[PDB]
Amino acid sequence: EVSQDLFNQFNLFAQYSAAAYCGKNNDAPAGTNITCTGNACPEVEKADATFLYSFEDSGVGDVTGFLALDNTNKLIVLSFRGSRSIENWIGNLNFDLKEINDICSGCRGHDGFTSSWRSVADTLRQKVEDAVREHPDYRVVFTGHSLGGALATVAGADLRGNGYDIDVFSYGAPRVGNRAFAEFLTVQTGGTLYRITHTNDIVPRLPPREFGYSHSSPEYWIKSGTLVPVTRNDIVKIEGIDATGGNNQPNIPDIPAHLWYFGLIGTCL
Amino acid sequence: EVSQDLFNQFNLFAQYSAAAYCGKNNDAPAGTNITCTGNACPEVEKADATFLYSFEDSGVGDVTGFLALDNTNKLIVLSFRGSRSIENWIGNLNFDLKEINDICSGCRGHDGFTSSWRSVADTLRQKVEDAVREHPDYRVVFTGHSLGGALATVAGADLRGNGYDIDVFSYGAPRVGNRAFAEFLTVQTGGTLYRITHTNDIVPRLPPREFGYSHSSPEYWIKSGTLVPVTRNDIVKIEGIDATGGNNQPNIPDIPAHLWYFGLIGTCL
Numbered sequence: 217e218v219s220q221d222l223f224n225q226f227n228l229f230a231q232y233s234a235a236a237y238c239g240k241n242n243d244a245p246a247g248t249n250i251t252c253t254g255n256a257c258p259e260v261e262k263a264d265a266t267f268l269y270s271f272e273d274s275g276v277g278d279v280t281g282f283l284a285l286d287n288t289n290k291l292i293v294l295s296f297r298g299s300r301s302i303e304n305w306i307g308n309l310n311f312d313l314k315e316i317n318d319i320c321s322g323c324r325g326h327d328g329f330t331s332s333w334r335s336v337a338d339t340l341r342q343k344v345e346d347a348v349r350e351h352p353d354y355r356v357v358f359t360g361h362s363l364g365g366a367l368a369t370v371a372g373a374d375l376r377g378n379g380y381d382i383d384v385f386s387y388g389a390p391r392v393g394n395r396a397f398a399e400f401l402t403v404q405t406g407g408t409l410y411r412i413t414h415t416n417d418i419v420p421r422l423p424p425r426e427f428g429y430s431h432s433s434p435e436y437w438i439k440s441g442t443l444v445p446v447t448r449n450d451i452v453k454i455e456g457i458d459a460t461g462g463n464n465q466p467n468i469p470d471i472p473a474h475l476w477y478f479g480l481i482g483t484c485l
Numbered sequence: 486e487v488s489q490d491l492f493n494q495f496n497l498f499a500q501y502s503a504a505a506y507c508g509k510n511n512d513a514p515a516g517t518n519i520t521c522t523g524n525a526c527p528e529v530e531k532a533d534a535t536f537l538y539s540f541e542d543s544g545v546g547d548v549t550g551f552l553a554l555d556n557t558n559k560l561i562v563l564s565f566r567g568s569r570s571i572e573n574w575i576g577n578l579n580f581d582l583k584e585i586n587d588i589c590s591g592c593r594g595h596d597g598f599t600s601s602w603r604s605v606a607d608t609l610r611q612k613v614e615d616a617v618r619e620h621p622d623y624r625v626v627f628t629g630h631s632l633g634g635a636l637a638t639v640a641g642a643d644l645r646g647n648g649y650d651i652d653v654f655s656y657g658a659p660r661v662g663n664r665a666f667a668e669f670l671t672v673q674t675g676g677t678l679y680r681i682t683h684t685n686d687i688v689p690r691l692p693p694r695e696f697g698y699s700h701s702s703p704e705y706w707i708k709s710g711t712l713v714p715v716t717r718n719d720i721v722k723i724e725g726i727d728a729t730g731g732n733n734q735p736n737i738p739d740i741p742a743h744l745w746y747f748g749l750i751g752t753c754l
């Protein structure tokens with residue numbers, strides 16, 4: 217049972233993550249109001265929120281997402297899309313580590329996640345830092361769902377400690393690297409990671425521990441079912457690197473539990 | 486407002502309808518339990534419900550669906566699936582009316598729906614008859630979403646007067662014919678038709694009245710939004726053939742609304 221306030225944040229960032237997919241982003245004018253089809257992001261529409269910068273298919277991993285300004289909640293939000301076809305994406309998921317000491321020493325991250333980030337880091341840090349400058353009081357937040365949540369967790373770890381806090385809200389994210397990296401994500405200051413999971417979501421279960429992956433702590437695990445509305449009492453905080461008892465349990469995972477975090481996500485009606 | 490009992494019924498056949506898309510029944514042997522992927526039909530799984538006969542791309546209409554026995558609720562249910570790509574189905578939809586006197590007098594119905602039913606009518610009539618025999622105590626219900634709603638509405642109108650009531654629950658069904666058919670279905674005995682629409686769903690708005698089509702009365706209009714749960718208080722009964730101020734408003738219509746009838750329908754997580 218998280219607080220009402222944290223619940224509201226959870227829900228708002230689920231929707232900014234869903235907006236990565238169901239917005240009418242493509243590349244629409246900077247300064248445009250953010251809206252989603254299919255009632256995907258009503259809390260965001262409600263907010264005085266607008267695009268700062270959209271990207272589609274940037275660099276090495278065709279990274280897709282947007283950078284938003286939200287004057288109602290006083291946020292600068294960097295939201296990364298997951299894949300356009302999650303099932304194929306999962307099927308083809310590579311498990312290779314590559315070194316990332318320039319984030320933290322001893323750290324190995326998922327090779328493709330880190331390479332996709334790496335290849336757009338400069339442009340995006342620049343875009344964030346710009347925005348930080350025009351709104352020094354606003355909270356920087358990176359968010360995303362699935363591969364999106366992955367990217368946002370890497371960028372956040374890479375980009376923290378340069379003056380401004382970076383909070384990360386991630387929705388059903390895969391593991392992003394090795395245990396050293398796990399540990400760093402669990403303690404790193406200058407921003408809290410809120411790693412959100414749903415029931416038996418298949419995505420937070422890849423890559424598996426077996427290929428040398430860990431999950432940061434803590435873990436916010438939604439226990440209400442697919443297509444069931446979430447209340448504060450369906451969310452459970454789970455402590456311990458690689459703790460079991462939220463998403464990380466020995467049962468059959470599900471793709472549909474992946475697509476329901478507070479509402480429909482990773483897909484667009 | 487509708488009664489709770491009525492609301493329970495509406496919800497249950499919304500799921501039987503949803504099961505026509507997300508059940509695992511392609512060649513499911515007769516007698517299998519009915520189950521769905523993605524929490525699409527929990528009230529159905531919860532009942533002792535099993536298949537009687539599954540069909541797929543049957544006859545001229547490529548009509549798909551199933552006939553089910555439900556011992557808990559004492560039903561025999563014939564469920565027709567809508568189109569596999571509803572957006573296409575929508576823009577490919579012609580407005581051609583055919584005479585259908587062999588169902589009512591001066592009745593004009595949509596050409597494709599009427600034909601598709603017509604070519605599978607005898608096989609299925611047989612199979613409903615068999616179960617009515619085997620379970621004389623059980624209510625016969627025809628149900629469907631979208632296309633499946635138009636089919637079910639047509640079969641019901643076609644197979645009533647033969648000694649067992651047939652009730653029809655349609656979900657976001659299109660218009661099915663001409664003011665005389667709209668009248669036939671308003672008044673016919675041997676059954677009730679429960680014609681359920683959602684907010685500004687587009688399909689109940691097609692074909693247009695401006696191509697000679699009318700809607701049977703009454704209409705149960707769901708006011709609550711897309712991805713919003715429905716309560717008995719969010720359903721309004723709208724009286725009068727082509728009444729307006731339910732789904733029949735001149736505002737701008739929407740496709741996602743079509744995919745949310747009590748829960749997700751017409752697509753499968």
Ligand SMILES: *[C@@H]1O[C@H](CO)[C@@H](O)[C@H](O)[C@H]1NC(C)=O
Pocket residue numbers: 249262263264265
């Ligand atoms: C965008 O929404 C803001 C308030 O959040 C509003 O003032 C503005 O007019 C809206 N723009 C359009 C084009 O609808």
Ligand SMILES: *[C@@H]1O[C@H](CO)[C@@H](O)[C@H](O)[C@H]1NC(C)=O
Pocket residue numbers: 518531532533534
């Ligand atoms: C099918 O459902 C019945 C009653 O609803 C149940 O008791 C039976 O075990 C089920 N069969 C399977 C394979 O689950």
